[PDB]
Amino acid sequence: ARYTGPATRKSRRLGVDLVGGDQSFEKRPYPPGQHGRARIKESEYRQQLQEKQKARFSYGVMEKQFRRYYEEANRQPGKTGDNLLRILESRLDNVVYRAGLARTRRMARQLVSHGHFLVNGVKVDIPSYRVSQYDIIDVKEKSLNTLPFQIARETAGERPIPSWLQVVGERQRILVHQLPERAQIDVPLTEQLIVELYSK
Amino acid sequence: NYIERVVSINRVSKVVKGGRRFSFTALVIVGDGKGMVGVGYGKAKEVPAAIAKGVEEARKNFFRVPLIGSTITHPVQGEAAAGVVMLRPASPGTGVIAGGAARAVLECAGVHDILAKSLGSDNAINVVHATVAALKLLQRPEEVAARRGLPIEDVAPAGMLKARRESEALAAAAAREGSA
Amino acid sequence: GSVIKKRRKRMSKKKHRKLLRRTRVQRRKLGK
Amino acid sequence: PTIQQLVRKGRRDKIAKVKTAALKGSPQRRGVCTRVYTTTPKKPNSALRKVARVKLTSQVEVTAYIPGEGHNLQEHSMVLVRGGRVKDLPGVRYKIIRGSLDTQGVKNRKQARSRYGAKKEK
Amino acid sequence: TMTDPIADFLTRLRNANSAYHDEVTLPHSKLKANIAEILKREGYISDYRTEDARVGKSLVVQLKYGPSRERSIAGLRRVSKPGLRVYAKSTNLPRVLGGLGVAIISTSSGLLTDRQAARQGVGGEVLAYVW
RNA sequence: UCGAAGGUGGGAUCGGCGAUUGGGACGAAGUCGUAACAAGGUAGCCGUACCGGAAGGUGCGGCUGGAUC
RNA sequence: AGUAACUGACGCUGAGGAGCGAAAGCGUGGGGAGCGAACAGGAUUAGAUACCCUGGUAGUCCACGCCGUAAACGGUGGGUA
RNA sequence: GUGAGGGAUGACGGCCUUCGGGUUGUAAACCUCUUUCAGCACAGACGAAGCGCAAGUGACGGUAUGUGCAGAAGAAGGACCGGCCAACUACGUGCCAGCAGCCGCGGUAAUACGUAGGGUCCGAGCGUUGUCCGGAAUUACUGGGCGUAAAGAGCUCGUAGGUGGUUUGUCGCGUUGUUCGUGAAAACUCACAGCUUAACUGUGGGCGUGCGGGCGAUACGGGCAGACUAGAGUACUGCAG
RNA sequence: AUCAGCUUGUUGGUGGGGUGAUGGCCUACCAAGGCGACGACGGGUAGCCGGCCUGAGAGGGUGACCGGCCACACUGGGAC
């Protein structure tokens, strides 16, 4: 399935903002519960444990899928970390959130899984669907009158979408040239320690 | 801005007619992450003094690790005390594959790609000594070529020379980029 | 070594030889 | 040894002792409870461990431990035993599953219920 | 009795090296002379020569050190010995010190180095490792 | 003629039970002694033989993995 | 060890096998001073099937055969450079 | 898939409290949103360049799939929290009830037993048992040992077997090179392609670590035929026990 | 091997018989051969493989699905 509990709870527990614009997190940068404020022993295993947990929770990926992405990255001729970041970035919900059409990643998943998008002209409602090179994404014409959709399109002034992504016109047609690179990705968190966690 | 690693803290005891006398011993590794290691053993009456003495005595013993880019030159086998440790170079992106004490020593050394395996006497101090012996047993192509009195292209294989060449090419690029 | 090892061995052998002596005629009767 | 000594004789691996021989290659095994009683643990422990002499369909008589707060097992009870060794009692190597056949789940249990055969109260 | 003249040659060289000797005198053999020539060509011994002894010939190997007395050869070992013999193809040639060493291989073309055999695409018997 | 099943006979071999009987392991609390560890109060141990409630004792040969000189 | 006249690799190890193998012990026939398991007393001791003391049979010895073990130890197989 | 947005220096209530206050927690209540899959309606397949010399021919199936209907409307549990190892407080029991993979926890302050709040890991699954491999270099070919830790036979002679000093010629058995045949398909790996993704399938290479046929090499090991005296044995002269 | 000896159509030959075909496959006669400490003759267990699981590899476990070969059809024998 997918996570259902409050996102702010886990964001505050991790100590790092996940959405970024939260207001209830920064005022409590400590973990929750009775003994969240207590100091904890410093062990690396724990460190990359929250690293992996926040990496796989900022998207919505469950444990099994994230593991599968890890083995997919490892077998590639390139470096494991960059491959894993690219594979996580290739998903549709990731793209629609990164294309400025969604304010929340969970909203992006709930929107892409409702059949409001068409990739290469064929209807797709798969949050885990992976895009490829030279790909074109459109929105079904019946949904252009949808109130949240027009709310999203009228506010096209948020943080600009990466170079590979292009929302070219008033029709909100998404063009992707090539898979994002590491510096192109510009996503926080450490990545080699995840390889260390899964390489024991 | 060094790298400090505490791998073992051990409480030792002496017997006197009154009772027991307790002391603490710490094994510490200090390195810069660029190819400099030092191993220190400190004895004191409590943990922080032991750690400080170990660090200070480690800094008095540094050694050079002959690594080409991100990994050692060639496989080596090291025996010290009763510990035996095997080191083998890897390919980029592999990561560090070693047990506790060896992992600490290699992480402090700055090597990022290595295959290490301990082959007996799992005691931390002896394992560390074996790892240090294995590292000291390494050789670098320049002095090998000098010793045999031949041009380096006649001694080293092609792949090692190519990896070295791209290594200093990347180093020069990094120096240029960090200059401005 | 340590003489505890030889001590264990000697005690076991001593007990077995005593047992053998105790059951001589019975063993000869059965074996024949 | 010499390589010729290895050619003549070879390497014979050690023998691997059989674990839980009474189950005869089965995860669980059914039995009839021939006796129920209590016994005292070793030197540093002090309790009344609840054990049962049972007779499996392997036609092997074994002792099994009864976990939990209480049980209602007497002679002539269909029980389902499984593996598991408790260090405290040297003789026992099997444990009676709580919640199968005639063995009831523990009462008033609300944490880690599955391992004690207690249903989730609605 | 004497069962392995080649390993005896290697161990006499090694023992003389570890005690910082300059000359090693040996019973003469054609294979020993070939090994010594291959060693000299690779910069492992200073020189080698042959003399007439009282029954047969003799082989004298002059060792080479550094300016501050650094031994030129770091290790010698015999791979294919009587008993278990070792033979290698042309596509599984060994590498010594990841390529920084020399593996003497006897092939039908003669006595070669592992790189020479790899370039010429032949295989044979791995006599020794020297590094 | 060959020929399955069957009948008769003496053996071979692998197992279960068995009145009675020997040793082994482990047990909160029992009785008898003091054998070994410091020259453990007779140095200890090894092969062999005899003897004794029990550890054990003694004869013959051997060892130092024995203290003091 | 010296000479090196002679043969010309005839060398090394050796599964199983065979031989030799302290002392004690066994068979037959002798011999028997001293010593001395076992067995008797005396002493010590709470008790002493022991240590110490007085006696004392087998044995120790010889001939011919058995057994085949020892802390049979340098707790360290043989050959070569 | 069981919902998404915003929502207070952040409602209760539970539980702790150092009696100040904190956690649950933006979580809940609240105003909008979209309906994935199920639900109710309508249409409706490919698989069939098929079969048949008769105008018919789909078991799956009125199924997959599309177009609509009002509504968040029908959808979450399981282990663990001494250390190895992600995660603590109160209460009840006191060597009792009980826990436990190792060491081991319980006798009036238990983070270890049981119940509550809190937390962590997974999530249509979560735990337990059984079996095999790994870690185990712990049968060690790769890759171990034998003075005192387990391990040199009480000592020799010798059968089969294993191994062998310098050198000349030949064979090409071991070794090595090349070429040809074979090593079914499926499986594995690389690349591509197809079903909305995936699992899944197809296509094309590689892999198929071996065997046999022809041709080449002769350093090393081996066979055959010679040679040498440095190993080994004998001969002569002396020596000690 | 806490199973060291086994075999008498048994090993070879000849003249016949039989078969789709070679052959002690069968028969009459003659010779005394043949196998084994690289394990004969006995006892226990088991369908074999492409593959599957594990492992850095060597190796260890395995023969479920799918595919190939063999053996069987209540137990034993026989032929059309």
From Swiss-Prot, chain A:
Disordered: annotated segments: 1-41
All residue ranges annotated as the S4 RNA-binding domain in the record: 90-156
Keywords of the record: Ribonucleoprotein, Ribosomal protein, RNA-binding, rRNA-binding
Gene3D superfamilies: Ribosomal Protein S4 Delta 41, Chain A, domain 1 (1.10.1050.10), RNA-binding S4 domain (3.10.290.10)
GO molecular function: rRNA binding; structural constituent of ribosome
Stated family: Belongs to the universal ribosomal protein uS4 family.
NCBIfam families assigned: PRK05327.1 (NF003717), rpsD_bact (TIGR01017)
Task of the protein: One of the primary rRNA binding proteins, it binds directly to 16S rRNA where it nucleates assembly of the body of the 30S subunit. With S5 and S12 plays an important role in translational accuracy.
Subunit structure: Part of the 30S ribosomal subunit. Contacts protein S5. The interaction surface between S4 and S5 is involved in control of translational fidelity.
Protein known as: Small ribosomal subunit protein uS4
UniProtKB/Swiss-Prot annotation, chain B:
Gene Ontology CC: small ribosomal subunit
Annotated ranges, domain S5 DRBM: 2-65
Coiled coil: none
The protein, known as: Small ribosomal subunit protein uS5
A biological process term (GO) from this entry: translation
Stated role: With S4 and S12 plays an important role in translational accuracy. Located at the back of the 30S subunit body where it stabilizes the conformation of the head with respect to the body.
Species classification: Bacteria, Bacillati, Actinomycetota, Actinomycetes, Mycobacteriales
Keyword rRNA-binding carried by entry: yes
Keyword terms, alphabetized: Ribonucleoprotein, Ribosomal protein, RNA-binding, rRNA-binding
Molecular function (Gene Ontology), one example: rRNA binding
Source species, domain of life: Bacteria
Annotated gene: rpsE
Family under the similarity heading: Belongs to the universal ribosomal protein uS5 family.
Domain notes: The N-terminal domain interacts with the head of the 30S subunit; the C-terminal domain interacts with the body and contacts protein S4. The interaction surface between S4 and S5 is involved in control of translational fidelity.
Quaternary context: Part of the 30S ribosomal subunit. Contacts proteins S4 and S8.
Swiss-Prot record, chain D:
Protein's recorded name: Small ribosomal subunit protein uS12
Modified residues (3-methylthioaspartic acid): D88
Listed Basic residues bias regions: 107-117
Superkingdom per UniProt: Bacteria
Family: Belongs to the universal ribosomal protein uS12 family.
A single Gene Ontology CC term: small ribosomal subunit
Region: Disordered, residue numbers: 104-122
PROSITE patterns reported in the protein's UniProt record: RIBOSOMAL_S12
Keywords from the UniProt entry: Methylation, Ribonucleoprotein, Ribosomal protein, RNA-binding, rRNA-binding, tRNA-binding
Quaternary organization: Part of the 30S ribosomal subunit. Contacts proteins S8 and S17. May interact with IF1 in the 30S initiation complex.
CDD domains (alphabetical): Ribosomal_S12
UniProt-recorded Gene Ontology molecular function terms: rRNA binding; structural constituent of ribosome; tRNA binding
Swiss-Prot record, chain E:
Subunit structure: Part of the 30S ribosomal subunit. Contacts proteins S5 and S12.
GO cellular component, one term: ribosome
Annotated disulfide bonds: none
Protein's gene: rpsH
Superkingdom of the organism of origin: Bacteria
Annotated protein name in UniProt: Small ribosomal subunit protein uS8
SUPFAM superfamilies, per the entry: Ribosomal protein S8
Source organism per UniProt: Mycolicibacterium smegmatis (strain ATCC 700084 / mc(2)155)
Entry's family note: Belongs to the universal ribosomal protein uS8 family.
A GO biological process held by the record: translation
Primary role: One of the primary rRNA binding proteins, it binds directly to 16S rRNA central domain where it helps coordinate assembly of the platform of the 30S subunit.
GO molecular-function term, one example from the UniProt record: structural constituent of ribosome
Entry-linked InterPro entries: Ribosomal_uS8 (IPR000630), Ribosomal_uS8_CS (IPR047863), Ribosomal_uS8_sf (IPR035987)
Keywords assigned by UniProt, alphabetized: Ribonucleoprotein, Ribosomal protein, RNA-binding, rRNA-binding
Ligase keyword on record: no
A Pfam family hit: Ribosomal_S8
Gene3D superfamilies recorded: 3.30.1370.30, 3.30.1490.10
